[model samples]
Target: EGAVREVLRPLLKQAAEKTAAGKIVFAEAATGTGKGRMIASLAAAAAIKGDTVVVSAPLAVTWQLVNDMKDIPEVRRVGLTLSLGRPNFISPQRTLEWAIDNERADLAAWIEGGGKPLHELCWLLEDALLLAEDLPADSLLLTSEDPADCPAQQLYVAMRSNYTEAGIILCSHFMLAAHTRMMQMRGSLPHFIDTLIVDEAHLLEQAFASVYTHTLRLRPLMRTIESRGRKPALDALKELFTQMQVASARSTNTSLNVPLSDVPELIPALKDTVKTLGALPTKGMSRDARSVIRIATRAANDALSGHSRLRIEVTPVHSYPMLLSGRSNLQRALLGLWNATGGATLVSATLFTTGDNGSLTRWKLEVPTERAAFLPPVHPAWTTAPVLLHKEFCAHEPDDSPEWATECAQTIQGVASTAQGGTLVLCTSYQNTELLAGRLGAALGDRLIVQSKTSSAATCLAQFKAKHKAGIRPVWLGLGAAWTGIDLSDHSLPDNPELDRLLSDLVITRIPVGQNRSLTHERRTAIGGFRIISQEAAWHFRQGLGRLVRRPGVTHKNLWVLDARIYGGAAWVAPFRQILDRYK
Candidate 1:
């Protein structure tokens, strides 16, 4: 405890000083420094100084922090509240049941007053109980025995009351993004927000992209149109799809950004479809029918709204017309709100990179702030230094050759046979994971445990841990799912020491270079373009490395990078080497 206080006290003092001077502080502390503790300490310090703090992290981290803060005397001294969005507090099944049992006039009245849209009403009901019961003062608000659980309204009131008095408000980044927009619309921005902390700040870009990017599916629209038996509307939508196919055929480029000019009849067709949907009978409609109508109406309205760029994305089986919008609105809105507050603190292990075209630099350009403070990386408490072993075997891509799969399977089999503790094999693609799982499963039989990409990751992990107790150290195979948020340290299984060991070896089949979406490429190209993609690969690589040395005093986890590109001299590879050399 004293060691933690010693390590983070100075860092928090620095952050608080910067906050007092009205400057954004970008700080990086190693993983073992107890970041959650530091966050609670900062919040408590702010309370002592009569300032309010709002801390937002990922859902998993936020919940864990809620538990962690209970042990911190400083945090308990100050008033703290965990404000989860309505969805977390209310059951969707109960909400829908309540809404369906009510009168049509009541439902119609709720719909008429600009409530959560009809299609979205499945999440809103008047007579549902809150998922949480006998909530603590540090928790979410309570409700009556039969709660009037309008999600939006209840959440708004809860946040308003919570923020008014709480010294620290804890929430997930998703909830914070929505709450920011809602507060803006309702003109309810709290004046007490003195400092904002973004834990795992590297995820800001991905979160913003997820919130802003919208998709319009063909099957859903067709299903809705078909349900109404509206042949004309269905035909109009089909015609637009036909035009899109023609445009794609005629063009030499493979960009998903479909030219709007090619589909001149698309918007008008959508408007007509929406008008037809708007006139559909609602009273006495089945839940599924109402759902379809609501979805169709929303899709049509969004298409006719002219808020996003239309793009055609084709898969092996289907073609989806995607809506891509510039991230400027969300970016500006977030930064604008934070800038209005006292100060902002961004914390992550890999917050900044070596190259000029790195993600951190890109974030700076987007936010455009001058008074920003930066901190360097600090060491973690791993008792034994982790080793990063790089072996470049073949130059050809894994998918390009069948031999690659066989070779990988043989190599992994050999590693698993001799490994002391459990082994985790991370693949870049699901196809390769499936192939290796099949081959290795056949060879190793009962010795291996392959986590199906199609199955629940949590269940697979739990099963793996449980199986380890019977004197089985199974080799867990996975793709993107296993790369992050995996805790395989000694503390992972408290009661079972035999199963309680850090991964003996982490085998990387390839660098996780995500698929290139045309719209993302187009939007990112405006600022250093493909370099952003390179930084993303670097980030993922770093995250994978992090899974190895979760605890300070643990050792024996070695990282094997099968991707030969790390040994090359490419511009993108430069940053990769720069990051890896730190652990080497």
Candidate 2:
């Protein structure tokens, strides 16, 4: 720990100086190296220098940091503890009672006495105070003592307030992006942010892709138009749909990317309808109605601008109705933020694993002014190469062969029965996950926990932890959601006589290639599908495999790959072997 801090201090000092001079930096360090600790050290140093910092990571990691920082003496001596406003810890019953009780008070005494209310409420009052402090006595949510003021909006205001005053803000990537937009529009952001550190920066590409992806539904659009009494607009849209159906029947292609010019009449009709809807007054509308209007309006406008770039596909909603979808203009959005901030540092263990620009290229980001830094692999725990305890590839691909399901079930039963602690089975798709879960549930009885599509990941994880702590080894089955941000470290569990240092074993049923054929294929076709797919698969493979060894001096467990492509000298699986060998 001391050695890592010593090496990181100078790098952090240099980063601070570079940021002050208007330059963004990129840093990479191997896994098991204290990335969070280094971030905390830098934040502590900046806080002492009177600079405010905001740290963002995956939600799971953010919570871990919140707990870990509480014990770091450097962070403790800084005198200000970072407050996390995530709603995960909010008690629903307690919050409802507090809301009802404090309906009339400006500042309830109980709140200050450690009575936790909904995070939103706290954020609103704090935000109103900030507004009053920065500007003057204004009639905001608190000022307008009307009973009709929305609780939701009040909570939003409170959220903004907590963000503004927090000396060191810890948040998830999505939350940070959302707040960035809020700051741009409202201008009530923290006075200044000297540095931005993105931990797990490799996942930023997928995060941004998810944020930018938009979908348009015909049913909802029709409903909005009909509800708003736009009869002419609805008729025009229906006519446009009829035209598309006629045109699509003449073509035989699986997908089409039609331009806005191709549907000239439809574009004008949508714009006119949006204009009409925008003119409606919000004074007497319910919050839900207003929210729907706002979202529908934005979706329509986004559709208009992206019409030329839109990819329309045939769907089950019947016939050739326009199922419009497209990637977002995320490049412009993120670049705008980069130019707005003092500086930023993108850090991750596998940032440069692809050898090119890596995640930076995929995200359309650049650190043009400075060169990125890399720390070589430091494996103090492994003076020699680590051996895989158990590794066996299946004879056939489950999705390709009829008998593969039976083979997979038998393999799972055998290995799971032998493992002492716990086993986690990661499947490629939700369909196969459910099938496998059902099979395992019948076989293992009450000793198995499976995550269905409707199951909450957090709840399932907690249950798994509890079962494992109680010395009841359970088999956990899940889809892609289980691949990352999952920590089953033995250090997190209570000491039990029945358990070893390793808490869980991993079983990867197959590579997580998303929905074999769909809009993803269309997008991939538009870009370099082969290259993008390879990198994505490799990244996920490493992420899942890396979970076996989290920290130094911890136990190493086995990884079972139940896909046949990994064997028989297949060229497609060559990169996977390279990644696995690198870890070995």
Candidate 3:
């Protein structure tokens, strides 16, 4: 009774009415409130009213949504809900020719021998293509002698021409971003979709970034390019990288942003290096070789977008620092979609900030709120969820402070005792994660699954989920994704997964502000960057609150966040303060 249909009627009505009136909407709801079903319903309604609904969601979310549609009679009966993607199959003949031409006689022999039927070995064919470029099959398809002989080639043409027939066309966030760019190159969004629903809408920034952001890798190009007038430039770049490494080490930061002006040598070096590589005759070059040039050239173009005072970043992860392409204009693309569509809906559990009514989020996206309706989740408990931040913990202190670790560990240990199940400690860095893990090691012993102790965050979180049932009161410690990724909802009764409050305590060691080392964070050239970071942090804080209330079960859950910044004084914490007080 609670999971799906409970909130369906109201949200479905609100979205349908506004979208019908040609308004773009920011639909904010709590986690586990069944926004998925509402999306399904709105899709059906739009289809019934003869509006082609284009649903853009994260791939996994779209995968689940399409499977859910078959059960909804209104949606299922209305029209086909197609999972939109390019041809995933391969033409056996085309692949064999490519294998022979590339001189892979062993592979050529196997395809010719054919122990397994050719049709049955599609999986094997796809695996072999992994060594090839991004679109090897698509590449071969276009050059095919006979289109009828290639199923993959035929399928590509069919899907490209007939996308208009789908009442509800489902695509991933990446695919949608790519499609929007496609409009600029060729035609508009297939048949001009009437309604666009972006599920998990918070990820829109990243999706756009993924499509537009280019990263320059100097090492590969430097190593491969022949020396002429170019060798000296390559040497200069090597020296520059050496200098940046020392800069990173001295700063004690994994990532540090530097001004492009600091390396005047890169200008002459990069320009000459690019010329040498770009001048290489690509005629006889292998696809892989050609691919290297394309990537470097693209990144080089991005690096030269701005000249002096432009931001560049260096980090421990990469051998060389890069001149990054700044983030794309999110508002421009968003506005285009809003105007092009009959109506649009941006759905995310964390769409609005702590004290926001879509203004902050909309303003950031450069989206106007004139014709929009902002809706909160049906659950009030999440907003009013219980919390207690111990100011004595000194969360405002620097990460390296010795006393801060002891204080936080003690605070966590105290609150965790009152919890029903296990506890989760979220941190902004690996240093804090390790510090807390060391601090709590004695009291908790083997029951604790520290993120740094495990191979990956996934491993520790998996151990926490599985070992908790075996009577180990597991405590998970990790960074960023822990806020949204930790799901302790009991699923034994699958029909409606209830919250027995398997995780009753959430310890946020500090506000999870992003690292400046990330090219995505941009430089702190202005206050605007700090607001962006804080806005993101508050959203994560709210999402962390969501972890405690899966379906709103516990009478009294615990939130322990001691970042002294939350106590007061910092202008950056304003958004976070609103959420704390509002929840209080």
Candidate 4:
């Protein structure tokens, strides 16, 4: 035993040293280097120093790594709790607020008074008012009559007060904006915020962009007033919704910059609509007003259509003097908390890449690092592949209508029949997926994997894999969600981006590529309007290819493009080729 200890002695000494003086270090380790070992070593050091250590990670992989670290005696001694939101866990309470009369008078009264049992109700009512963008005037007077009954008034008083605490709180990017808003409302130095660390920092830019952006959809506004039982206001929203829906259907140009010229009319009409709503007496505003608002808002929003246009851009800042201003406010808060923690190591796999790259950079500006570097494929085989498609494949084309749904089903069937088993057929739309499922169900002979019938992504994937292992070639026909994530190798190309191309083609064929001189004029500029559209098309193509190579050791798989129009489009073939080739 003593002779054996001598051989293993050096590793034991280093492990002890690592757990004693843990410093902020970035490890550039290979896959089997046991990064978890290093993390546990440092965490033990924190524990010995009497620090309250909380270890957390983003996804399942990191959590698994943490679980492995628990094997260490020191790591095992510490208490570990996983804080995550489960779909099944019911919230504290589902709120119900019945605000009666004058736009949001009942809500105003509730805000003015403070009630223990109805606090949640009061908060919900206030939130609904904000959602409706309507507030009651001079309702603070009701607070004195019954202080306990007027939560609305108490909220106003609190809003006016400058007492607050500042403290560092780690949160996911999902709720970053909401938390920031809460801090600002308190109007103090957060009286106690000391530091904040944002893990999965790659999503910071997107979080900030979403936080800073303001959107006004005509539907919800229409729905709110209608729920207040205001027929006149409801009618106005209906008209707007109908016109916008008609415009969207016809592809009449609409966007932040190139919106319909008549679109400005909706804003004034909204103001008038809300004004009329304020005059109406509420008849259980939450119950009646809620349902009416819901229906109207949907109608109005459905009428207007446009892509999610990116506008905000984020950059690093070195200050935090206030809580809310714009981009600067978020920068200040983040920087302030970061400075409090003295220093931090921001690590991401694709950090330095900008929006120009195909990384998540367009959404989040991350600082890339190669600490956990990945090696390139050993065999660098180059193949110039030609993708074939059946005739009449444009489902997104106006000609790609329900009338041709039968044809789409037939082609999918033909593709499946040839592959017979171990094939994955990805469709672009749910409607198409359903059509193919119904058409091929009987012919599949226990070799079909249709997503619409499956319970979840994991379930469908598992069943598909099982069938493949059983020597029965199973074809998984999935639409939308499945194209990019499903790994169906062993056979040829196992996925498709048919729906994306169909969507793009439908937009181009049905919608006018802005004919307005204002927009058309920009087609010649540096970031021409036409260039943006072309770039969008190229982006979709690359995304489709990426789906096939998602898993490691996916070298033998091929990516098939079903829409021939993608490679055959006029004036875009060369541009498309150049863009498409980069991904390959």
Candidate 5:
């Protein structure tokens, strides 16, 4: 541990210096190499130098980063932890007891029905009462005497108290993006921050994409509009939705992405819905109902003018997840933050995995005076672990074929039985996740934990840890955020001397991206899809592999990749193979 910290001090010093000289630096290091440690070291250096820093990351990573920094005495002396998604205070004046007897009985009932455990009453009431309308005067609910009674005022007070030129702020990517806008409008300004570090920089585009994306959820809108009685626009939207079923419908492909022009009725219905909901009022409507109409109205307006691309999902309520994304918005936001800050560093385990200027080409992110840095291994994570694949499972068959699925299940079942600790099977999609769960259930019963769309990530992580720690030799199947968003070991928690790596077996079912026939492909660069897709797949490939060997002293681990494309001798996959060979 002492040697690990000694190795990092020099690199973190360089990170601090490079980011101080008005540059956007990409620091690429594999996970478990202590990416969080580098961030904390730099943040503390920036603090002692009297530089204000804002560190932004995915919320899951945000919590991890916050925990990482909290252990530093320098951080508590001069830094602040804030996340818009998490508000830790309880409401005094507007408690759940008060709301249940008032008009918020339905929210209380939803809680009683297990919408959220009763313990989360504070947040439930906070949102139920304060999250709607322009102001309390405009709200159907009453206000509190103390400003701190509400989460917004609580944040306002904390920000005011925590403001320090020598301090740091840890926030989610959403907070960082929204903070830039708020500064522009309300005058907090990016120049107020000395250094801006985008942690988990591989997800920078996705972070800004969340900021600029627009979605028009049909089911809730239809329900909200119908409750106000039917209108011609409602009939028009339903007609458009019926036609959409044909497009949103499933295919043999892994996922779906359609263009706006493909649905002829879409544009007209978008116009109708926008026009109809534009003047809609909250006159006597409930808060939830009113907010839904307002957002759907805004989404419809944006869908018509700003962006194209219809992303179809089985989120029955959120179907037609039409994205009105703006490349300009992302570029503008990044540049504003870069030019304003003294410097910035884009830190991630896989930022440069996509190649030179990949961030610029793919996400429209242009850095002014950029530099690149690579972190040395603080742990022998990859050196000790070997990549293991099976010829039996790597059959030269279609990825979606039933025969291929059975072969994967067959090999996984055999290997999982002898796993030293626990096994994690990362699937390409939820469909295959369920398929594996069904095929492997009887064999691994009492030891299988599957992550469904409805399952909580926190719950899955806890269950996996508990089962593995107990020697159940469990096999966990997960998808989506499970790829890299999950931080299995909490850096905040003290390590157990007896414990080593968190995982024994890591099974990657297939390459993660390029499965969908996205019509938005036209909007990507002149670079071909396979190259772009290969870049994305390679990034995730390394991320998934990094999950197994978490620390230098960690146990020897095995990686089983079920993707045959890497060995199929396809010329397009050469770049991917080149990157994969680095660790294997």
Candidate 6:
């Protein structure tokens, strides 16, 4: 801890002074740079000052930090209420249904039969719903056998308001966004947040981008509006469309076609589109929204039961990447924080990296805070460097003929030899992972540790960590979430969740990009969820790569990036090799 102590002094001092002076302090440090320890030291000073500290962080890193800084008595950690992309509450009516009829509610008298007393029991009933929702798909507590049948809104409300005052409340960036909403509605939160410490600072941009924007696909919005069947809203919509048509006829960039008044004129068309689409059948049709609408409307006219015609269960509606359509919900959140006499601090080693600061700076403007001083770099006292390797893992297309399993097995076998004690033979998808896991197990004998569907992601990660420390690198063979932010230093090949991983390795087995983006659409006026794929692609690269070389002094650890496109001329990825090397 010699160098770690030295590296923390300045941060501890600065944070202590800032708390004393009522000034916000921002500290920037890179991966493996003892940032966690330094922050914990700051938390200790807060405890000494009788100030509560909250460490809101991503779910993956939150528990990891709780374990890492368990010695820091000042940092009492509250886990994220709803993680893994879900909210925490259900509608009031559903809550009543569950409490009264749910087999688990044995205490019938205290649980209540509904009404005025029930509203007061919002928290309890909501929590019950949450527990029910959290149950695994096959669990007896599941509200329904179908996972999709579970109402998501319940979890949304639960997580939006779960924490009590004092100590650090840890959560993902999404939680931070959700919390912003909570603080605004509630008179005050359980405790005041003095400062913000963000690990994986490189991801802040993507986080801000994700929280700030919302995407609404034109077709889906139209459908929803159509379903509402409000003549006024629908009439307003068609009128707006006429204006947009007039505007589009005269201009290329409708965004540039703004006089501000144009927006009012365009609402009718947008609403009309929404109304028309909403009136269409909710079930049974082509995979395409337009096609689905056509089929559903026909079915509805024929007086058939809706379920008999259910076409697309899932529709890619406009993504509210940040908020509702055309709504500045994020900006509103940022302003609320500012108005409350509180400012936010974002810390990361590469705050100024990526050559351009425009997007980040724009993101910062949302906080209504100026750039505070970054603490002086603390000197480290140790030099223990282990050799690490960076290998270009080849991405292979699935062969049309036989021996797919054999090919994967051979590849895993080749890599496993270099990896010695253990290897995480990461795959692009579960099917691919299973093929490799099965074939390689037969070829290489027992001691293979393939992640099974039975275990949760956290469980898999725990097992992998335990195995790694015991000098057993149990190969976690899965794609997507399994592939990234796993702290195993000896992990080999292909970071999962990479957009390119999605494009190349994962999708190679089936589906074309053209089909994936969608076949057709009748374009409408309102922004139509502009440039989401690019925006998502940009952030996906940032977060996926953030998984590698998590801390400093990890130079020698090998990363097998399987995306062959890094060698290609794609503008976005052209910068990836350099970014990867810098971290390496």
- Winner on lDDT between 2 and 5 is 5
Residue-level lDDT of model 5, residues 1-584, one tens digit each, is 12225545665666677777665666665566667877876776677777777777655555567667767787878856553432222232323333343334444443344334221123322233222111111112222223443453454455546545437777666556655554544543235678878787765554455445555656546666753435665775676566555555543432434455555556776777776676455575654455556656756665566444455443364332332323323555666655667767777666655444445323435454344334332333344444444433445443666667677788788778657767778887667877777877878887888876445344566688887666677788866656665655524334741344457678777777653232323345244555666665666676776676554545446667667776777886676567566554
Which stretches of candidate 2 lie above 4 Å from their native place? Answer: 1-23, 30-32, 47-52, 63-152, 159-171, 179-187, 190-193, 210-269, 306-329, 354-389, 438-441, 490-502, 514-529, 582-584
In model 1, which regions exceed 4 Å deviation? 1-3, 71-78, 87-165, 183-192, 217-265, 281-296, 305-307, 311-316, 319-329, 355-365, 381-384, 388-399, 447-453, 490-502, 514-522, 568-572
Q: Judged by TM-score relative to the true structure, which candidate is superior, 1 or 5?
A: 1
How well is each residue in 128-202 modelled by candidate 3, as lDDT tens digits? 332232213332322223345455445545656655555777766666765665564463246477988888887
Task: Provide the lowest-lDDT 10-residue window in model 4.
Answer: 501-510
Best model per lDDT: 3
Q: Look at candidate 3 and give me any clashing residue pairs.
A: 396-564
What digit string (tens of lDDT, one per residue) describes model 6 on residues 417-492? Answer: 5654434454444566577666778755445656543334444555656665565535555444443444544334
**Candidate 4: segments with Cα more than 4 A from true spot:** 1-171, 180-262, 273-422, 427-472, 483-584
Candidate 2: global Cα-lDDT?
A: 0.54
Runs in model 3 with CA error above 4 Å?
1-4, 73-165, 184-191, 220-264, 306-323, 382-399, 416-419, 452-454, 495-501, 513-535, 554-556, 565-578, 581-584
Q: State every prediction's TM-score relative to the real structure.
A: 0.76, 0.72, 0.74, 0.45, 0.75, 0.49
Off by over 4 Å in 5: 1-4, 47-51, 61-166, 181-192, 225-264, 311-329, 354-364, 368-393, 396-398, 454-459, 489-502, 513-522, 525-529, 565-584
Clashes of 4: 39
Query: On residues 130-168, what C-alpha lDDT tens digit does candidate 1 reach at each position?
Result: 111111111111222223454544554555555544667
Clashes of each: 4, 6, 1, 39, 0, 54
**2 or 6, which is superior by TM-score?**
2
Model 5 deviation from the true structure expressed as Cα RMSD, one decimal place: 7.3
Q: Flag the better candidate by lDDT, 2 or 6.
A: 2
Q: In model 5, how many backbone clashes occur?
A: 0
Sorting all predicted structures by TM-score, with the top scorer first, yields: 1, 5, 3, 2, 6, 4
lDDT of 1 at 492: 52
Off by more than 4 A, model 6: 1-4, 8-28, 44-53, 58-179, 186-329, 341-343, 347-365, 369-387, 390-412, 425-455, 462-473, 489-556, 568-572
